[PDB]
């Protein structure tokens, strides 16, 4: 009644604080955005606070809101079920022939705004590769795969791909776990998919290092077949 | 001058010979099946010729026909394009907390029958885990991801999941390269997806160790989004 989805029936906002490093160099991001009900198509503005981000903004796409994915009736929406107590996320994305980003995320809801703090360590990145040299152009869509992971968690597996300036491709491997903070016995959804489409663009309003990003996310399932 | 999808406009059949080992134990499988036009929903019957298969049939699912996936107009069908010259597959499926299968596949078309030979090494498997103990029940659907891979290849990435006998899960990681065995310049499709749904049942006619398997496979794409609702770019 006033937990889970019931708390996502109106328009909402969110705010994010990221504390990071890449190959030793530190950085800080703050961001804010919003999601109109019925959700699933939303936007975020982000800025680097410490000056110029020392790596492509593109791999940050997934740090700058699973509870704003839209779920149809018939599939339990774990990330929305986690409230009001909140949730955490532990995530690794490993880039082929390049480095790995490991992040930890906390989410709290107050009123109609969800606040996140994230620490991320980006290590082993190649100084000459497209990430450190800012040569990533588009973000490919993903059909991310979701699985139940014990009584209090769900796991997300994905292939996250980026096109490059010379017309090629860089592949990332995402493995992510969402854990409910409370003791309450929420419904763990069974195996399903979440389709995620993303478009990041530089905001040349300010002379600050800042980007706008839009996301469409929608969960679905696939039927069995008989013999 | 007959090639690619032109060669797939009728009902077809296929035959597979698999030469495998799992943890040093050699085995042999032979399969056959058919696919009716317009393809995308098709069957196979397989049998272990060396007696009793020493592992679960479940992970053999993807060894026992990409060219029978159904593609919509607007997405080039790489596996069909590779004919008449033929198709090779190199593939690895690594299972979490368990072993890795490494396969080499070669496919050739004679008439309306696609013949294939596969070699597969299944190594590092756990003798007490659910593959070696035959405790896998269902095959989860996958939203496989396809990508261009140079001028003569495509790469498939997937997660292949199985349910177990006590109601849990076993996850596999699949990485597969399809290569065209010819020199003509064929179209390499852009990123897209192939949904695959699979159902395997033991066939309990006769004493021989065999299974029946049905697969539904369809390609789809996902569109781009513009920077806001109602714009363009």
Numbering used by the authors:
A (entry chain D): 1 to 64, 68 to 230
B (entry chain A): 1 to 64, 68 to 236
From the study:
Here, we presented the X-ray structures of dimeric KillerOrange and monomeric mKillerOrange, the only known to date GFP-photosensitizers with Trp-based chromophore. To further expand the toolkit of available phototoxic proteins we have very recently come up with a blue-shifted KillerRed variant carrying tryptophan-based chromophore (substitutions: Gly3Cys, Tyr66Trp, Asp113Ser, Asn145Ser, Phe177Leu, Tyr221His, Glu236Gln) named KillerOrange. The principal structural fold of the monomer in KillerOrange/mKillerOrange, shared with all members of the GFP family, is an 11-stranded β-barrel having loops from both sides and the chromophore (matured from Gln65-Trp66-Gly67 sequence) embedded in the middle of the internal α-helix wound around the β-barrel axis.
The crystal asymmetric unit of KillerOrange contains two dimers and one monomer forming a dimer with the symmetry related subunit, while the crystal asymmetric unit of mKillerOrange contains one monomer. The dimeric structure of KillerOrange comprises two monomers related by a non-crystallographic 2-fold symmetry axis that are positioned at an angle of ~120° relative to each other. The contact area (~1400 Å2 per monomer) between the subunits is stabilized by symmetry related van der Waals contacts, two weak hydrogen bonds between the side chain of His148 (A/D) and the carbonyl of Glu146 (D/A), and two strong peripheral salt bridges between Glu99 (A/D) and Arg158 (D/A). In KillerOrange dimer, the irregular C-terminal tail (residues 224–230) sticks to the surface of the interacting subunits, contributing to the interface stabilization. The contact surface between the monomers of the adjacent dimers is smaller (~735 Å2 per monomer) than within a dimer and is stabilized by two salt bridges, two hydrogen bonds, and a few hydrophobic contacts. A continuous chain of seven hydrogen-bonded water molecules in the channel covers the distance of ~20 Å from catalytic Glu218 in the chromophore area to Pro192 at the bottom of β-barrel. Ile199Lys replacement in KillerOrange resulted in ~25 nm blue shift of absorption band maxima accompanied by significant decrease of the protein phototoxicity and raise of cyan emission, presumably due to isomerization of Trp66 from dominant trans-cis to minor cis-cis conformation.
